[PDB]
Design a binder for this molecule. Sequence first.
Ligand SMILES: [Zn+2]
Ligand SMILES: [Zn+2]
Lengths: 1095, 67, 49
Amino acid sequence: PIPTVEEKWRLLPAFLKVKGLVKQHIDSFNYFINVEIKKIMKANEKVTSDADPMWYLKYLNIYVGLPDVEESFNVTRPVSPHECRLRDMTYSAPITVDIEYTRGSQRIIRNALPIGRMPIMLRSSNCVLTGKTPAEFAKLNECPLDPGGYFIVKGVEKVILIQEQLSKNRIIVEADRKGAVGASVTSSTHEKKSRTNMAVKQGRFYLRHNTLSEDIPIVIIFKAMGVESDQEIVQMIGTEEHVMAAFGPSLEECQKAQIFTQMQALKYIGNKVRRQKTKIEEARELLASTILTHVPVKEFNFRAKCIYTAVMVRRVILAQGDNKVDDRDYYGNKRLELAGQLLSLLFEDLFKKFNSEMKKIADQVIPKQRAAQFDVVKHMRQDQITNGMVNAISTGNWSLKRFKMDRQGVTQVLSRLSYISALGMMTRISSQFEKTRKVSGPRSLQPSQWGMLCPSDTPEGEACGLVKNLALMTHITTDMEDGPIVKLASNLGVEDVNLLCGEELSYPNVFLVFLNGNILGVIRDHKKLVNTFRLMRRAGYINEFVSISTNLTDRCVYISSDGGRLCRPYIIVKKQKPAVTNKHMEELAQGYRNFEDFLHESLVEYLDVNEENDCNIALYEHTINKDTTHLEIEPFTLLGVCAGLIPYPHHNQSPRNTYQCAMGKQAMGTIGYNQRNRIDTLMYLLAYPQKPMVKTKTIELIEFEKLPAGQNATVAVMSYSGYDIEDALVLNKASLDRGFGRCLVYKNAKCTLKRYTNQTFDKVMGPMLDAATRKPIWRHEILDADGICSPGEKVENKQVLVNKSMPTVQPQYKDVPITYKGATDSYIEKVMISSNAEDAFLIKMLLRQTRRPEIGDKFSSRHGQKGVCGLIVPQEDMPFCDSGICPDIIMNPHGFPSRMTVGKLIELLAGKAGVLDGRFHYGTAFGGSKVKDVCEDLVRHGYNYLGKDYVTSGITGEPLEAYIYFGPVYYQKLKHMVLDKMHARARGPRAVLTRQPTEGRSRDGGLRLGEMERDCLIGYGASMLLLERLMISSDAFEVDVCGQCGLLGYSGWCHYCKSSCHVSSLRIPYACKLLFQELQSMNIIPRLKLSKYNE
Amino acid sequence: MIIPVRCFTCGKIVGNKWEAYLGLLQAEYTEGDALDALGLKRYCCRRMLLAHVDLIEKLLNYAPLEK
Amino acid sequence: LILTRLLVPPLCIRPSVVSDLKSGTNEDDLTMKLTEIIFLNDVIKKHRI
RNA sequence: GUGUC
DNA sequence: GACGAATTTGCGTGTCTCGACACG
Ligand SMILES: [Zn+2]
Ligand SMILES: [Zn+2]
């Protein structure tokens, strides 16, 4: 027995209260509008014209305000998110700057100068939805359970997906189609993205960069950098017997070509280099700040760069001859990208554009002036900034050629189908690779990721790993500086690389220090370095988000402080024991001693993927060994948000887990606290949502017990007459009549109407009365005397909702009556009439439709078991066992073994025991409740102990030989009803380009007959039907051509021969005639030769 | 949203004991004590009141009120 | 083998798009390319004189 | 672009 | 001994890289 603290389950809620799931999406933006927005202002700080050096403007301070709207005339009132969501407006706040400009001779300092607007997040620091109370949240008509984190642009909720990319400022050594090759990608803050690569062929190293014409020898690059004597070159490379046999050839081919001085190498390079000022200076400045710009050069010293290239060559040599290769599947190198730095790049590019083009606005006015003073605030504009921001957010085209980048599909509309689909989309992560079949590694589950990305959470289909979700406990590190870090490392006793030569780095005892892909120097006895750095980090002086690791195969220590790293807290242990005790957590339960002081007391700490590489972590407290360094808080935090709804995930199989986590976001239910006020395009709601009996701790963490998307129902696992085939399930007619599974659909119909540049307008006449009696006509029946439909009415098929009459171009008006198209008979809920930002009237209507479950509706079991309903059985059937309880949904026992789902029976047992006793049973992953204490509790009541009951068949009236498995199960209703998945067409509209059925059901189109279905008709050998349903029913056309010269005539007449003597006709599909008429314009004339079918 | 008037499986009226169940949960009574004192004995007509959420109460705070 | 006379295809092979947005027409890319190459046919005849 | 087979 | 002819091999470039339905 070992002392075990059963209290560490309350650390996780206190940790999520600080940050975590979605609070980091707001942290990245709150830090960006407080730190980087002024860094960009300081970057572009002074700009002046060149006409005469007397005019200039200066940037003092910049800041943003609160969400405000500019109405008719100087009307700035605080607007709420719901108002912007209903008025199709955009949630944004202005950016007021305090700049100074010199006009004439004196200087003018105009305070509070507006330059544009910028969108603000829903739960950010500048918004009104922060620090409020639920009573006040109900005052602004907003759900308090809304996590937020999206953008409202033109009345839609847009969220920016997190995108993962590879690490920059690092060396990779990977193998390709022939051999091994090293590469280096360089990209700092300033826009300079470079990709250099060193390759090996014929025992000769060659350096490739897109600025050079062809290969340049590495020894030539060395001699050009400044290292002249060939001895210290090999000294820097490596002093070993096997590294010289591979470096001799290059040295001797270098001696072959007559290059022995720096000027010779520089002239050689300049002659090699092509670019569209002499050759020596060209080659000098090209080796200075073009190839590797992440290694700064003070005056003109290429020593750090040449030692960097030498250690790169040494890594390539040690990779050469072995099977040690670097892969891109490691997640310790992969970095994440939020919406903060994207907005940063967008804003800095827009600001640079606005500063550089306005520099040209006052550059054509100074010589061609009219007075002595020039005002610049009247030569100022505030539409490009707002336009660019809104366009980049809504459109989704991140195109920055100043940054040399084009990205599509970054922002997406927030899924508002259910409460899980909304939160689960915020943790969705996108990859940099495109959706292709070639990938198998990155799609495969990597052993590197542990507790950072949910393994089960992934969509099944085409993308099978390109889309991943975050874990419950993880944190994204923001960027820092490295001043104090380098200072403390220099004080610890690290050596300057500029003093010692190349020979000492080959020493095994010597270790190299790397900081964000930068060589700081040489350190001996790296263990003391790592220990002291870790102790200083645990102290509190250095920030906690600084990684340190050591690698012995290449003998280098890495110090990582870049932003975008994954961090999760771990409990520290000291030589046999966790530092956290019972007295430390009793205070946390009391109300003091929270997470931040726990970190300040050196009891827990963050570790990254690369830092946990050199650490031992214990799963539980009974497996703690003498080399374990950290202790994982809880093992059930590995599962994600969508995987936390599955009872007993370890009992279930991974395909079923994936199916269920994918179907959890499609399950329909309640949306939030304000679903009657919000008017979305499509909304699915339930009538009476029940509460899951067997709930999970993750359910309580997210508070899913307030917005459930399912219902509890009695299930009987047994075969029925004939309608529980592979996935079919049987319903109870009496239960369906009582109201089990009642659904509601809400559709939106919005119409905007505006004015024009002339005095033309739009108008709504309204209803039409006849001459016999005073009744509205059948066309306009629901319309009110105003001209719109009144709520609380019933609209049938092809009836007018609103009359819209607009002029053709006194003027003639064409009426465009909006007509409702639907197979069902809809109902009107409410009507909203408002105005938008551009002075146009907007009329919105919400249409309600109540539906009941029928044969052809898809249901799930919340265990990866989906099926359409089979036969609807009345209550005379569906046998009761003893008390008179009938099966609500009949389940088939034949789909259990193949699917291999054992958690379903355990969940049923736990739910039955709970509904009998009267308390909810915990079913969390890697724990919960067992099947030993629950079955003995099912005996006290009087039922059987595991699952069995005596049933009496109803259709015959005889008992059942074998026993049946009865119990309550949490079922959920999904989308894709048979009411919408039902189409039929005989003769409808056709396209103008080709006479063929159009695409889609919204335009009443047909079905497509592809080649794979044509192959089935060909393999049979039927020719009449193959021609009947491709030419007779699709497009039958009668064309005419001539016998003298094969050409398409008209009206039995040719324009080439100008004679109707040789004229005949035939039957051809319109597609073939169109192809002929298209090819005749390509200098390809299909001269046809007719004949009699008798011939 | 609202407690169902009748049960789904058997059809027993379970909508006349919701307010009584609420008022009996504040007299220092256990969930099982309230459930077996109200009159529910079987479990098909017992999870209607036990596992039930009340969202119309939160939906009336956003409801139109007269001034 | 050398093109010096271009054949204008029929007008029914290049339908025009109409918008219920801006009282707007949208031509085919073939028509736009034809109007762009005909403008090149008149800019050379003006430069010789 | 998203969702299902 | 010196020049015209024919062989083998490293290197340049173009084409795709299953089907279906529904919604905005
Ligand atoms: Zn002819
Ligand atoms: Zn009942």
